[PDB]
Amino acid sequence: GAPATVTEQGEDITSKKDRGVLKIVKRVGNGEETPMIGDKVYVHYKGKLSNGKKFDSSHDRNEPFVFSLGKGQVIKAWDIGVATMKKGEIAHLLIKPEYAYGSAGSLPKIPSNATLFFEIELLDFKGE
Numbered sequence: 001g002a003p004a005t006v007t008e009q010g011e012d013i014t015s016k017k018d019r020g021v022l023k024i025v026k027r028v029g030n031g032e033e034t035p036m037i038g039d040k041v042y043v044h045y046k047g048k049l050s051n052g053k054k055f056d057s058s059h060d061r062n063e064p065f066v067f068s069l070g071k072g073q074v075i076k077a078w079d080i081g082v083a084t085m086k087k088g089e090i091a092h093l094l095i096k097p098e099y100a101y102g103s104a105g106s107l108p109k110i111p112s113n114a115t116l117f118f119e120i121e122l123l124d125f126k127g128e
C-alpha cells in the first residue's frame with residue numbers, strides 16, 4: 001500500500017536524519033514558495049494508523065483543515081512536512097511515533113508507539 005511505498009521510496013525530511021518523517025510527493029505544486037512559521041495554512045488530508053484501525057478525513061467535513069504552521073498546533077511531523085510543501089502539492093507522509101504521539105499516545109484514539117500515515121493536499125497559505 002501507500003505506507004509501504006513511502007517506506008520504500010520516501011525522502012527523510014528530518015533534520016536528525018532518523019527516518020522519523022518520510023515523504024513522497026504525489027502531485028507537484030506551483031511556484032517556489034513554501035510556507036513560513038506563523039503562516040495560516042489550509043489543507044485537505046486523510047490520516048490513518050499505519051495498520052488502518054482509525055481513519056480521519058477533512059473531506060468528511062467538506063471543508064479545509066486550517067492551522068498556523070510551526071506553532072505545534074499539530075503533531076511535529078506536520079509542522080516539518082507541510083513546511084516542505086508547495087501550493088497545490090499533494091504529498092504522502094509516513095511518521096514514526098517520536099514525531100506524532102510518542103510513547104504516551106493519545107488514548108483511546110491513538111495507541112502508544114503508533115506509526116501514522118497521511119495524504120495531504122496543501123491548498124493555500126497566507127501570512128500571519
Ligand SMILES: COc1cc2cc(c1OC)OC[C@H](C)Cn1cc(nn1)CCCOC(=O)[C@@H]1CCCCN1C(=O)[C@H]2C1CCCCC1
Binds near residue numbers: 055074075078
Ligand atoms: C489526537 O486527536 C486527534 C487526532 C487526529 C484527529 C482528531 C483528533 O482529535 C482531536 O480529531 C478529528 C476531528 C474530526 C477533526 N480534528 C482534527 C484536529 N482537531 N479536530 C487536530 C487534532 C490534532 O491532530 C494532529 O495533529 C494530526 C494532524 C492534523 C490532522 C489531525 N491529526 C491526527 O493525528 C488525527 C489522527 C490521524 C490518524 C488517525 C486518527 C486521527
